[PDB]
Amino acid sequence: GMNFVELAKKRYSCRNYQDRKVEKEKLEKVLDVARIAPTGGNRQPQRLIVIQEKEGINKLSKAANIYDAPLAILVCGDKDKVWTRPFDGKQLTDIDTSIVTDHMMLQATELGLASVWVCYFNPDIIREEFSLPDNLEPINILLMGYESKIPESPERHEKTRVPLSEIVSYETL
Amino acid sequence: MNFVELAKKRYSCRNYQDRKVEKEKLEKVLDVARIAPTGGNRQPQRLIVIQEKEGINKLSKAANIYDAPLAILVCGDKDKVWTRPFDGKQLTDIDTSIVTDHMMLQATELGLASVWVCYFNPDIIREEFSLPDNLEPINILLMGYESKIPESPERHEKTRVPLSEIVSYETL
Ligand SMILES: Cc1cc2nc3c(=O)[nH]c(=O)nc-3n(C[C@H](O)[C@H](O)[C@H](O)COP(=O)(O)O)c2cc1C
Ligand SMILES: Cc1cc2nc3c(=O)[nH]c(=O)nc-3n(C[C@H](O)[C@H](O)[C@H](O)COP(=O)(O)O)c2cc1C
Ligand SMILES: [Cl-]
Ligand SMILES: [Cl-]
Numbered sequence: 441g442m443n444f445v446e447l448a449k450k451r452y453s454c455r456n457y458q459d460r461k462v463e464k465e466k467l468e469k470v471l472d473v474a475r476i477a478p479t480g481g482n483r484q485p486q487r488l489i490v491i492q493e494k495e496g497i498n499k500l501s502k503a504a505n506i507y508d509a510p511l512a513i514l515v516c517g518d519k520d521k522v523w524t525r526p527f528d529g530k531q532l533t534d535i536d537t538s539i540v541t542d543h544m545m546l547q548a549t550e551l552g553l554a555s556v557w558v559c560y561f562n563p564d565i566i567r568e569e570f571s572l573p574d575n576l577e578p579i580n581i582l583l584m585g586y587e588s589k590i591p592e593s594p595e596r597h598e599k600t601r602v603p604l605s606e607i608v609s610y611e612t613l
Numbered sequence: 614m615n616f617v618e619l620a621k622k623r624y625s626c627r628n629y630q631d632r633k634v635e636k637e638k639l640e641k642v643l644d645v646a647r648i649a650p651t652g653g654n655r656q657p658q659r660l661i662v663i664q665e666k667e668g669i670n671k672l673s674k675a676a677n678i679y680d681a682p683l684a685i686l687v688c689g690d691k692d693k694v695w696t697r698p699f700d701g702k703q704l705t706d707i708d709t710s711i712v713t714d715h716m717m718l719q720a721t722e723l724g725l726a727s728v729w730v731c732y733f734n735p736d737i738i739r740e741e742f743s744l745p746d747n748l749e750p751i752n753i754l755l756m757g758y759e760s761k762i763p764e765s766p767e768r769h770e771k772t773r774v775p776l777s778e779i780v781s782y783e784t785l
Contacts, residue, residue: 441615444722445641448648448715469617475776476620476769480731484773488780496783527734534706535731535752542714543620550616559652559707562699570785580707597648601656604647608660611668613742 447549452592454554455507457585462492462511466551470513470584473543480532485521486540487576489514499569500581504561509583514566515541516576537579544582554587619721624764626726627679629757634664634683638723642685642756645715651708657694658712659748661686671741672753676733681755686738687713688748709751716754726759 442450467490474488491497491512500506500514517533524531541557548555558581566578639662646660663669663684672678672686689705696703713729720727730753738750 444619444719445644445648447616448645448719451650453650471776471780473617473620475773475779476617478623478625478729480729482772484779486779487785489785490780490782493783523731525731525735527736530731530735532731535710538707538710539714539729542711546718547616547620557650557652557711559695559697559704563702564699572785576785600654601647604643607646607656607658608643608662610662611665613659613661613744613748 446594447546449594449597451545451549451555452596453556454585454587454591455556456588457507457509457554458588460510460586462553462584466548466553467492467511469551470544470547470553473547474540477540477543479536479539480523483521483523483532483536485518485533486537487516487518489516489570500566502569503565504558504581506558506581506583507556509556510585511583513544513582513584514570514578515580515582516572516578518575519577520575533577534579541580541582548582548584552586553584554591555582555584557582614722618766619718621766621769622763623717623721623727624768625728626757626759626763627728628760629679629681629726630760632682632758634725634756638720638725639664639683641723642716642719642725645719646712649712649715651711652695652704655693655695655704655708657690657705658709659688659690661688661742672733674741675737676730676753678730678753678755679728681728682757683755685716685754685756686742686750687752687754688744688750690747691749692747705749706751713752713754720756724758725756726763727754727756729754
């Protein structure tokens with residue numbers, strides 16, 4: 441099988457999805473790592489809504505373009521559970537849920553699933569449509585399915601990323 | 614080894630050997646910070662690799678870093694990151710956390726123990742590393758070699774709530 445960098449390179453953003461549904465067996469594997477993931481203080485504030493049926497897909501579609509993906513997971517963070525930093529009041533809500541989302545997205549990739557991470561949504565429409573209580577904030581939508589065209593190349597990053605030297609320095613800025 | 618095995622075997626290490634992290638392994642860890650996606654491909658992450666005395670001592674002023682031999686301070690650039698117009702929410706924590714997660718998983722594959730740290734004094738970090746106002750320190754990822762036997766990959770039955778408490782289908 442592939443090593444981690446090969447997996448990380450293979451993953452790309454898919455916006456062209458087949459009709460084909462995600463097999464229950466693959467969805468369950470994707471979910472398992474949402475639990476295995478670490479969270480600040482082990483607080484486990486992540487709250488997931490698995491969406492693969494028509495009403496929910498339509499509800500998400502009121503808030504975002506989900507590109508006819510056959511499966512979406514709405515990842516919320518529970519601010520009643522999350523750790524809060526004493527110095528400045530910063531809450532780990534986005535961090536914890538993103539670790540969870542990233543773990544899912546990598547696991548989905550291993551299983552041959554295409555995906556795209558979606559933050560371009562109207563959070564108010566999501567709150568209303570899914571009747572979210574005040575303590576749950578919708579953070580990420582992860583879409584998954586089967587690519588309908590040609591996957592992006594695992595060696596594209598020379599063209600799609602800035603050089604490493606532009607994001608890393610040593611000891612000081 | 615498959616992905617779930619890698620994610621299971623990762624745990625939070627709080628006691629490290631003196632052994633330094635080899636350059637070859639650090640470079641592989643950094644490689645995935647670039648590979649990782651960010652919202653809009655904005656690539657706002659700004660990393661400071663800390664493996665020398667002064668920098669390790671600066672971190673220790675701000676946080677408990679468990680005498681780790683290597684730290685990466687992961688900042689987000691507010692001048693690059695997307696700000697969502699609807700509500701003003703910035704992707705700073707999201708984009709940086711994808712990067713940091715990729716790094717932590719890569720470190721684990723290479724036999725490096727690690728711990729993610731957010732319990733740090735951000736004003737101390739800002740001052741000590743002379744961060745400009747556009748750079749927000751988000752995560753400190755610590756790495757090295759574990760001093761004792763790692764935590765079990767099969768521990769999650771005890772160290773996590775049931776999947777049923779975090780997942781529902783279609784509706785809450
Ligand atoms: C936090 C985050 C939010 C994103 N939001 C969206 C989104 O709302 N819609 C979309 O089509 N793609 C979205 N993207 C996908 C990015 O455009 C993509 O990751 C980036 O351009 C790099 O492309 P690649 O993933 O194919 O390497 C998002 C990605 C990230 C990491
Ligand atoms: C966002 C985040 C911030 C964390 N901050 C700290 C920290 O400041 N200090 C620390 O000792 N552990 C920190 N942890 C480690 C967690 O306590 C740990 O991941 C959790 O208790 C689960 O244990 P495990 O990682 O061994 O499975 C952090 C973890 C995450 C994900
Ligand atoms: Cl985007
Ligand atoms: Cl032991």
